[PDB]
Amino acid sequence: MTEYKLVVVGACGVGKSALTIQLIQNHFVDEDSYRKQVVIDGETSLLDILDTAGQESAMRDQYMRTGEGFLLVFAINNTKSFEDIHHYREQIKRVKDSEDVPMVLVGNKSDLPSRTVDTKQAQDLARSYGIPFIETSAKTRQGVDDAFYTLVREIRKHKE
Ligand SMILES: Nc1nc2c(ncn2[C@@H]2O[C@H](COP(=O)(O)OP(=O)(O)O)[C@@H](O)[C@H]2O)c(=O)[nH]1
Numbered sequence: 001m002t003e004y005k006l007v008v009v010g011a012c013g014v015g016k017s018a019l020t021i022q023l024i025q026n027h028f029v030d031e032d033s034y035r036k037q038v039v040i041d042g043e044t045s046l047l048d049i050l051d052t053a054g055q056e057s058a059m060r061d062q063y064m065r066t067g068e069g070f071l072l073v074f075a076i077n078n079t080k081s082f083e084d085i086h087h088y089r090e091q092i093k094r095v096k097d098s099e100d101v102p103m104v105l106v107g108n109k110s111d112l113p114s115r116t117v118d119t120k121q122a123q124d125l126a127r128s129y130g131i132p133f134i135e136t137s138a139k140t141r142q143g144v145d146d147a148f149y150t151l152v153r154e155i156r157k158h159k160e
């Protein structure tokens with residue numbers, strides 16, 4: 001059976017755990033690792049997921065090396081978390097020693113009325129990186145399946 005090792009990275013508090021809990025366990029209430037079989041485009045896929053901010057080492061650096069795809073998560077009401085994205089992407093590229101690593105940019109907390117990061121800013125950044133941008137809410141489930149499944153599709157594209 002096909003397995004995908006996914007890593008969800010981003011500043012603390014952006015909702016990495018909340019997004020992964022919503023995907024895997026289907027709930028939100030206002031575990032660092034998760035493992036579940038799902039079906040994506042008719043392919044049975046075992047998802048092995050790690051949520052990490054990088055400040056919590058061994059399992060982490062290992063996780064970055066084996067990770068096949070990465071969600072780069074910021075929150076739309078956290079400018080610093082958006083500013084941090086470049087650091088996370090550069091870190092992954094260095095560890096993977098590759099310019100072609102499957103990634104998706106995720107702007108979480110889209111349900112909130114407080115916004116300090118413009119959708120255009122995020123779209124522009126993702127365009128520069130050549131990766132998808134998806135607006136999500138772990139609370140309402142907006143974009144959650146789309147974010148993770150898009151990443152799995154990026155991994156497939158890489159492997160093809
Ligand atoms: N309103 C809202 N709150 C969220 C969302 N995602 C996460 N949260 C809340 O933001 C806080 C931090 O979320 P958490 O999953 O622990 O962030 P992490 O440090 O990135 O894993 C918690 O109080 C969550 O309930 C979201 O999409 N919308």
Ligand SMILES: *CCS(=O)(=O)NC1CCN(C(=O)CNc2cc(Cl)c(Cl)cc2CC)CC1
Binds near residue numbers: 012013053055
């Ligand atoms: C994901 C974050 S964590 O698990 O690594 N823990 C963080 C929680 C948020 N935080 C804080 O500093 C918030 N609090 C405070 C801590 C301290 Cl030491 C002081 Cl002096 C004051 C506050 C409140 C402002 C970072 C770690």
Ligand SMILES: [Mg+2]
Binds near residue numbers: 018
């Ligand atoms: Mg967490």
